[PDB]
A = this chain, B = another copy of it.
Amino acid sequence: GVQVETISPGDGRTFPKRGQTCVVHYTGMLEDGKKFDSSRDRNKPFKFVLGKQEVIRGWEEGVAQMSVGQRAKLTISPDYAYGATGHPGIIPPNATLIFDVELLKLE
Contacts and interface: CB of A to CB of B under 8 A. Distances in A.
So how many copies of this chain end up in the complex? 2
A41 B84 CA distance: 30
Interface of A: 48, 53-57, 79, 81-85, 87-89
Contact of A87 (B48, B57, B82): B82
Contact of A83 (B54, B83, B89): B83
A58 to B, nearest CB: 11
The residue among A56, A81, A85 with the most chain B CB atoms within 10 A of its own CB is A85
6 contacts: A54-B89, A55-B89, A56-B88, A57-B85, A81-B85, A82-B87
A83 to B, nearest CB: 4
Contacts of A89: 48, 54-55
A83 B10 CA distance: 36
Contact of A88 (B55, B84, B85, B88): B55
